[model samples]
Target: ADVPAGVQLADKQTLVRNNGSEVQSLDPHKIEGVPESNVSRDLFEGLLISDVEGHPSPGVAEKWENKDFKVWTFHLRENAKWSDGTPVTAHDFVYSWQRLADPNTASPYASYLQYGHIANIDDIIAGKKPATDLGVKALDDHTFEVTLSEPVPYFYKLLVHPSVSPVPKSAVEKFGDKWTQPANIVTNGAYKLKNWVVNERIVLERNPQYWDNAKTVINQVTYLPISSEVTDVNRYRSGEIDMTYNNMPIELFQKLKKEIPNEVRVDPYLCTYYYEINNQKAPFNDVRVRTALKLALDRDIIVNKVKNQGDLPAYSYTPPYTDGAKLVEPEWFKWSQQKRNEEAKKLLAEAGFTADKPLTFDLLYNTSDLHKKLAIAVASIWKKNLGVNVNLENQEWKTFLDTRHQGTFDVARAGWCADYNEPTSFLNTMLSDSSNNTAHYKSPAFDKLIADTLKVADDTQRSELYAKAEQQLDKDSAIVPVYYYVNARLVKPWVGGYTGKDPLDNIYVKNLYIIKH
Candidate 1:
């Protein structure tokens, strides 16, 4: 069935959709997928939340201001209440921020707080000080203060992350790791968790205690972890799901464009898809080997032919839409495919690889039709050009994340959707001590460049330092960046106010409303 100009729901204002995959976890501190991101946004309110346009807006905090660029104060609403009817106080945020900095917490994104931005963060993360020593404090039940080590241009933007959402201490202390279970959770967002069926669906109902509950139009939202692009497309076609995100087959994109033009949407997203090379290992430890492998793959073919989407071929870590995107790459990354292939062969030879003693390794990726196809295409190019024998290994998403973190694979598929619209959002993950650096890449010079950016207050100078860091990262081949992402999705014409962008793409179900006849 083709999408209608509008469709009326039978009962309530319910919006059902797929978040790409099963949510990894609902705990604000432990989630790792886009699916879980929306759930966190729906069930828990943070100090600030990004609007559809990616601007930081009020969530639990009515407003905030920075004094001297190093100290910021947030005013929490006295009326804000969690689903359990507890007042949402500044202490909630204090607890959440402290928990995020607790080294024992082991949150992968926790190192972001250790970037020397906040005062006492280093000592707290190092366990030299308690988590309570984190540079945040609740002056009273309603006023919260955060002192930074230095000025950060995008400090507020960082507050919009789901990982920074406030967690109820009572619920967490009682339930422990199971605090996020549907039966035990308490949240202060526009919606409350109603039902959660593992690997099946999660249903959310409007939260009566939400400060702005009256304006929240969608009464119910159901998230289905439909991982298969084919299944998501079918569900959307059969009217089982109202919208789908990046879960559509590339092969059907052109056909659907001609058939149901109004149903498809493709928007430029601030994301990069890449491969993390195990730099601590034998072969990839060589810069020549890393460079050869990167140059062998034809990004033009991968983006245009294999992916068959309008995704841009990425030669650098940062997406071209970021604040200083132009500075993230060199000239040769834009060279012709033939020229690149020839240079790649030279690099392989320089690294002691040849037809007789060709470098052989296994390429790892999460199990998905799209990832497998893309890996096979890249693997073939390397085999053809550099005489590299590449074997393909696929693991499920959870297992893959674990393997990548444990540094168990040779070269594994890795991706980053920007946390904010800045180069640092992409660069921070590759820092020498960054917990998210799954490649295990370490570079003193590269780390120094990243650190220098934090001290400079001038935008131009900071961007310049970021440029140097990008160059240093490229020089070391920290990661083999493949392409910049574009979010492709299908939205029923009946759905209004639902547009998926980049990092927080599906996190706006609160703003989505169904159109009725």
Candidate 2:
């Protein structure tokens, strides 16, 4: 299926969903975890398809073989072509991936490519050497080869994402800095870029040159970036839009149900919102202080009163139903309130924090009305439990990121949705010792266990690796996990099929069928 498969599914009507954070650009070379160019997934082609459920499936490359754990080879489809009618070749994928990993780009997602057996990936991203030293190569226009430093169990899954998508060599050289913008985008998938007006909307139409264009239903689509909850609810209610995911304000959430309950969808998303204490400073250095701060407020109140729009309070790092992956909950839940108090007391005492240690910290959060409510809840908890005064600090999402990154805040809160299906997708980044590790916390044994876990081929073995690592988190009080996110998309029952799988709740028009609408 080269096209978006929209044409075969519906007429020209596809109500697209919007998001809180705007996508950066179309260049697969710089696209982080979630490929923002909806056009790219539908219009551009990748060497492999990460979307396949049961196992790795054929994409731009039709078939592949693994010579050994260290090496793998791929054979491209004889029928793939860019929207401009140019041949989609193996070199495109190799070139695009290597470019994204270039030190010049400074993409945070680079570690994802070289995570487990792909050891030198960080080295390459850090200005160590060229991608030629890495294990991937293009044998020809139709075939490709890859060499892994060690076995990559998730290598096949990586193929399905655009990170490994073949970017047209001509596109890069032709546009240079402008390559990611619409004027220079070259696509090989189901749709082609029609429009993208920043802070407004993006439009995409069917790619006539796609190998599978005939199979897609929708010929054209316009994506609006809506932030207002009532506007989104009314858009769906009044029939101004076809779909809107990631919900609106709680007032709008309840109003939508009263007005059009059938349109609301609440699914347990693979996202966990938490607070990170930067250990580089003095206040957060002691685990007991962190625990006292965590134990003060009740999580039940937050789940029920603070965020009543069907969000599950989180106790563990992993959320449920992540591409059918399972995780163990923390043992803290089993403890009574008294026991919890005793545990907090013991931790605080060990950390040299007295009942009045004069611990005052700034809790940084996003600048949204709903987020502000959650912040208040967290503050109340700390005030009630730890007897510590938390100064609530709020900033726009972008500014808040800058503040936390600059290390201007004492305690920062953030949400983490899975980038992919695996467990490591959640645990790896924040816990890893790279620059992305804002917390700057590291344990060689913990990282080694995580490294060794990815090498294991079996589910049971993988769980064993993560189990050891996560247990270490409880011992260290690494983070205060709040709750698992439930992505509440108000899908009109009439709209049948535009499925999404990324843990970050990636909203794309590809594979979406206006089945009923």
lDDT, each prediction: 0.80, 0.66
Candidate 1 per-residue lDDT over residues 1-517, each given as its tens digit? 1123445533467888887667768888876556667678888888888776667888788899998778989999889999988899999989998998898888877876765377887787778999888899999999989999888767887777787889999998998998877889998988898998987899999999988777677888898877677778888889888888574575567788788989888887887899889999988889999988888888888888878777888777888678665575677777887888888899988888778898989999876667777888888888876688889998766667878889857999878887767888888888777877888999999888888887777788888888788888888887888988887788888787755554436356677677763
- Each prediction's RMSD to truth: 2.9, 3.7
Give the top-scoring candidate (TM-score). 1
Model 2, 357-433: lDDT tens digits are: 75678988765556667788788776666566789887654456656657646888776666556777766765555
TM-score of 2: 0.86
Off by over 4 Å in 2: 1-11, 33-40, 50-56, 320-328, 337-357, 394-408, 454-458, 499-508, 515-517
Q: Which TM-score value belongs to model 1? A: 0.95
| lDDT at 70, model 2 | 60
In candidate 1, list every pair of residues with a backbone clash: none
Per-candidate TM-score against the hidden true structure: 0.95, 0.86
Model 2 global lDDT (CA atoms, 0 to 1): 0.66
- What's the distance in Å from true for residue 13, model 1? 1.1
Clashes of each: 0, 22
